[PDB]
Amino acid sequence: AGYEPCWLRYERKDQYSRLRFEEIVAKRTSPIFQAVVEELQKGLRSMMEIEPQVVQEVNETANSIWLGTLEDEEFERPLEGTLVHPEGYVIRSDVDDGPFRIYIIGKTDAGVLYGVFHFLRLLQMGENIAQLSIIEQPKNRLRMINHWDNMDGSIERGYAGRSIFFVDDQFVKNQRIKDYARLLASVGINAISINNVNVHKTETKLITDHFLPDVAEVADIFRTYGIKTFLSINYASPIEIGGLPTADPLDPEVRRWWKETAKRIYQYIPDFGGFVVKADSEFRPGPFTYGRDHAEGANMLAEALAPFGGLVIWRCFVCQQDWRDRTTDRAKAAYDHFKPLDGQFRENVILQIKNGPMDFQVREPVSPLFGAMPKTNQMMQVQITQEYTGQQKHLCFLIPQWKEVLDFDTYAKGKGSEVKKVIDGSLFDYRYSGIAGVSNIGSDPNWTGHTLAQANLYGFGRLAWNPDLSAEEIANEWVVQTFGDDSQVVETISWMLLSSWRIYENYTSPLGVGWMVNPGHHYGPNVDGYEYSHWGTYHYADRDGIGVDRTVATGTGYTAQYFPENAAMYESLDTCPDELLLFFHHVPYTHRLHSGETVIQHIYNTHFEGVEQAKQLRKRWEQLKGKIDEKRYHDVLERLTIQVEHAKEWRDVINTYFYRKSGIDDQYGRKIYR
Template identity: 60%
Template sequence: SRRIEKGEEANLPSGVILKAEESSSLAKEGYRITRAENKIFIEGKEPAGVLYGVFHLIRLVGCGESIEKLAIEQAPSNPNRMLNHWDNIDGSIERGYAGKSIFFDQENILLNDRTKDYARLCASVGINGVVINNVNVKGAATELITKKYLPQLKRMADIFHGYGIKLFLSLNFAAPMEIGGLTLADPLDQQVIAWWKDAFKEVYEYIPDFGGFLVKADSEGRPGPFTYHRTHAEGANMLAEIIRPYGGIIVWRCFVYNCKQDWRDKLTDRAKAGYDNFMPLDGEFEDNVILQIKNGPMDFQVREPVSPLLGGLKHTNQILEVQVTQEYTGQQRHVCYLIPMWEEVLRFKTYCSEKKDTVADIVSGRTFRQANCGMAGVANVGNDENWTGHDLAAANWYGFGRISWDTTLTAEEIAKEWIQMTFSGDKKVIKNVTDILMNSWPAYEKYTSPLGIGWMVNPGHHYGPNVDGYEYDRWGTYHRADCKGIGVERGPAGTGYTLQYHEPNASMYEKIETCPEELLLFFHYVSYTHKLKSGKTLIQHIYDTHFEGVEDVETMIERWKALEGKIDSEAFERVMKRLDEQLASSKDWCDIVNSYFYRKSGIADAKNRTIY
C-alpha cells in the first residue's frame, strides 16, 4: 500500500481517542467515529470494533476524503467473514498462484513478520476468521490438532487475536483412524466420540479462543459419515456438540457430488447434487453448524447461476463460499476482478420469502434470523513479494473483505478505494485502473466458455483452452456440443435442475425465451442457428465475443501503458508482463474455441475473419 502523502497530512487532527466499552450501544464489531474540538473519537463495544474504526479512518485519509466533520457508525453485514486457505503442510498450495504458503514449510509452521503483516491486512478489510490449511487434509496435516503443532499454532492464534481474527483449521474426518489408533470413524460410535472430545479439549487448552473447524467430507474421495451410513447432519452434529462448550463452530462444506459419473448418462446432473444432498436435512443441524455453499452449483466457473441451496435452506445456518484465488478465471496470470460477480450473486433475488430474499439477506442471517452465517473466500495469497502474484489480483483479496463487511458496496466503489490505497489518487490512475478492473471479468468471459456452459479448460491444472478436456471424463462437466448445437438441457424435459428454484426463477430458467442469455447454455441445449436477443445467431455470438475478448485485452494494455511513470516501476513492469501473457492466452482461447465450433457446425463466420 502507498504512504499517506504530504498534502493529506493537513487534514489530520491533533489527536485520536480510542475507546472500547462493553456497555456501548454499538453492534458487535461495530464502531462509531466522531470529531470534536480537533480530536477524533473512535468507539467500539470491543477492541476489534475500535480497530475496524481505525482502519476506516485510515481509508478515508488514504482516499483523500474530508475528515473535518465525522459522524460515522458502522456494523458488519455478516457475522463471519472468513478466508479459507488451501495451503498444504509441505508448503505447496492447492490452486495457489502466488508462490508457496505463508503458513507452512516442509511440515513446519511458519511464524515471522509476514504473519503479523497478513493479519493486519486481513483486519484492515474486516476479515475475522482464517482457516490456514487445505480442506483436503492429508498426511501430517491431520496432526495439526495435536501437541506436535499446537504450541506453534497458539503463537499464531495470539497474533491473529490482536487483529480480531480467530484461527480455524480444516479437519480430517478420519483422524480417529489415521492418528488415533481406532479402526473406524463412525460419528455415532462412543469410542470415536470420546476420541474427538479429548482432541478438542487439548486444542482449546492451548488456544482458548480457537474458532472451530472446516470440514470437507464425503466429497472427491475424502472420508465422511456416508462410509457408516450416517448423514451429513449426524457427522456435523457430533463434532458440533463436542465443540459447543468452548464456543466453537463447525463449518461443513456442501461441495458433495458424484465424481464418478458416466458421460453417456444425460440424467445424472452434478449441478443438482448439493441441493439433493442437503435439502432433506434442513433443520437437522445444530445451531453451531454452518453449511458452506459455493456461489454456484458447479465449481467456481466464470459464469454460473446462483446455487438453489441459497434460498432453499430455511432452517440451517449458511455461509456463501466464493473463490478469490483464480482457479478458473486466469490463475492470476490474467487480470479478472471478481467483485462484480460476487455483487451479482449477493443481489440475486431467491424469492424464498416475501421480504429480505436476496442472497445477501440470507447469508447475513437477516432472512431467517440466524446468528451463524456469513461469507468465506478461498484465499489467493502466497509468499510472493506482492502477496498475490498478479499485482491487480490483490483487488480481489481487498474486495472480498470489503464486500463481506458491507454487502451494499458496489464493485466500482471498492475498486476505486483499492486503487487509491494501493497506487495513488491521481485521476488518470484511478480512471484507467478502474476501467481495467471493471472490464476484466466480462473480457475473460468473452474469450473463454460461452453463455454459462463453463469448463473447456485443460484437465488437472485448469489453465488454458481445451474444449473437450473434460467432455468424456467422470466429473460431470459436459457441454454436449454436436454438429447441431450445444448446451445441457436442465429444464423439466432434461435433468429437472430448474425445479430446485423458487418461482418465478424456476419458470424463468425453464424456457429458452425467458432464460437470461448469459446462462443460456447452462440451462438449455441450443441450436447454433438460434437467434439471440441481439439478432445474432448463437454461433455468430460465439465467434464475435471471442474476437471481442481479445480486443478488450488489447485495450487494457493500452490503458496500463498510459500509466507508465505514474505507478511504481516494478509494479508497472510486473503487471505489464502478465498482461502480455493474458493477450497471448486470449488469442489461444479465441482461435481454439472458434475453430472448434466452426468445425463442429460447418457454419462460417459472417465477417470472414480467420478461423482455423
C-alpha cells in the same frame, strides 16, 4: 522489505494535506488495542509525519484521537447508542469550537480496530475529516478466508507463490503473518482457516500436541487483529492418529475422541474458531463410509465443539457419474442431498456452499441451496484464487460477479430475498452465517501473483463487511490507496478492473456453460477437456447445437430447485437470460439470443472481440507509464502481455472447435483456422 504493503501504503501526504494531532487517547490496554494503537501510529507517521504521544486520558487542550468502547466514554452520545453489533463502531468529530477531537467508538475492542482502519482509509483517500459522523456495523457475522495451503509449502490452486505459513512439513520460523493479519483486519476479515480443506498426512497432525504450540502462536497473532483461527480437519483422524478402529460418527469412542481433541485444542487456543470440514473422501473413511448422512457426520463434530463455543464449517461436498446418462445432473446434487436435511443440523454447524452449484466457473447460476434451508445456518464461499478465472495471469476483478450473486433475489420469502439476506442471517434469523473466500495469496513479493489481484482480496473483505458497497467504489478505494489519486491512474485502473471479468468470460466458456478448460491444472482452452469424464461437467456440443437441458419439461429438472419466479425464467427458452442460456438449455447453433446474435455467432463475436478488449487493457496500462513505479508497472505489463497471448489461444481454439463442429463461418469473416 521482502513484500509489498498492498493497499496499506500510507504514502506521505504533501504539505497541504496534513492533520494536526498531539495525542492518541487509548482508553484500554488489551492486545487488540496495542495493535490498534500501533497501526494508528504507523499510519499517521507515514502519511502525516506526526508522532502523537499515546496517553490514557484526554488532554482538554490537545488535538486528539480518542479510542475506546461505550464503556470507556464519559458522555455516551445518541449515535453510538444505537450500536448493537459487537464489531460495530462510530467515528465522529467533536462539534466543539476548541481542540480538534476524533472519537473512534467501538462496541468492543474489535469494533475499535475496524474503526481505526476505516479512519486510516479516509486518510489514505484524502477525505475531509473536519466533520465526521460515521456509524458502521458489518452485515455478515462470519467474514472468513480459507487457505488451501499444504504443510510441504505448496498451495492447492495457489498461483501466487508458496505458503507463507508452512515449509518442509513445519511452520515457518512470523513477521509476514502479522502483516497479513493487518491486511485482513483492514478489510474486516474476522476468521481464517490456515490449512487446506483437503487434509493430508502431516496436516492431520495440526490437531495434536506436536503442532498445536505452533498453531497457537499463529492464532495469537491473528487474535490481536480480531481474527479467530480455524483448522481444516481429516474426518478419519481417530484412525490415522487416534489409534481407533473406526471413524464412524456414531461410534461411542470416536465421539469421545473428538471431544477430547476439542478440549485439547482449546487449552492451547481458548478462543479457537472451530473446524472446516470436507467429510468424505475417497481415500479415507467418512460419514458415508458407515452409511451416515451429513447431519450425523456434522453434528458429531459440532457436539465436540459446542461446550467451547466452536463452529463446524461443513463443506457441502457431495465424483463419478456417467456422461452417458443425461438424466443425472451434478448441478442438482448439493440441493438434493442437503435440502432434505434442513432442521437436522446442530446450531453450531454452518453449511459452506459455493456461489454456484458446480465449481467456481467464470459464470455459474446461483446455488439453489441459498434460500432453501430456513432452519440451517449457511455460509457462501467464493474463490479469490483464480482457478478457472485466469489463475492470476489474466486480469479478473471478481467483485462484480460476487455482487451479481449477492444481489440475486431467491424470492424465498417473496420479493427481497436476495442471497446476501440469506447469508447475513437476516432473512431466516441464522445464529451463525456469513461469507468465506479461498485465499489468493502466496509467498510472491506482491502477495497475489498479479499485482492487480490484490484488488480481489481487498474487495472480498469490503463486500463481506457490506455487500451493498458498489463495485465502482470498492475499485476506487483500492486504486487510490494502492496507486494514488492521479485522475488518469484512478479512472484507467478502475476501468480495467471493472471490465476484466466480462473480458475474460468473452474469450472462455460461452453463455454460462462453463468449463472447456485443460484437465488437471484447469488453465487454458480445451473444449472437450472433461466432456467425456465422470465429473458431470458437460456441454454436449454436437454438429447441430450445444448446451445442457436442465428444464423440467424435457431435461434434468434442475430449474425446479429455484423458487417459482426464477424457475420459470430459466425454464422458458425465450425468457432464460442469454448469459446463462447454455447452462439451462440445449439449443441449435442457429438459435437467436436476446442480443439478436445466433448462439454460434455470439461465440465467434465474444472470442474475437474479447482478445481485442484484452489488448485494450494492455494499451490503457501502457499509457500510465511514468505515473506508476517502474517495478509494479512492469510486473503488471508482463502479465497483461501474457494475458493477450493466451487470449489469442483461447479465441482460436474455441472458434476452430465450433467451426469444425457447426460448419458455420464467422459472419464478419475474421480469421478462424480450419
